[PDB]
């Protein structure tokens, strides 16, 4: 369906973990925007997401995310460039 359940977890302290439902029409950029809205990040350029080692680029759609019940956790990396 359209219910794309994703888990956002930061590996670097503070290690926060939040779960939300997105849409398949949304891109990685939407997740970054959402993260800022939840006051967990400052700039989009600081948010670098990864999945199983593969870096998730802004142009990537959530529909192409190889997320299963096992790897439903997205790696949230935040750094000032």
């Amino acid at each position: 369906n359209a219910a794309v359940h994703l888990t956002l977890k930061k590996i670097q302290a503070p290690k926060f973990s939040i779960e939300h439902d997105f849409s398949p029409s949304d891109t990685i950029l939407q997740i970054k925007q959402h993260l800022i809205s939840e006051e967990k990040a400052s700039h989009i350029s600081e948010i670098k997401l990864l999945l199983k080692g593969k870096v998730l680029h802004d142009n990537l759609f959530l529909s192409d995310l190889k997320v299963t019940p096992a790897n439903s956790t997205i790696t949230v990396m935040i750094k000032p460039n």
Binding site: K9, I11, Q12, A13, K15, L50, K52, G53, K54, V55, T75
Partner: protein, 79 residues
Amino acid sequence: MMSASKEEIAALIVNYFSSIVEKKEISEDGADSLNVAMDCISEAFGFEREAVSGILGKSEFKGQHLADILNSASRVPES
């Protein structure tokens, strides 16, 4: 001994991190960071972290780690 193949080096790199998390030598955050870092290395080189034993088993690094090898390896900069 048989040169330094990228996959062989990568195997030692991930093994090193694994040797750290196996005894919690790194912090809770570092452990998480190292976990994903190893995953990135695996997919970038073309192997799996769960297959590190298989790589080291073939390589001449079986029973060795990146730490001990680098420790024994000593070079003296003549400068």
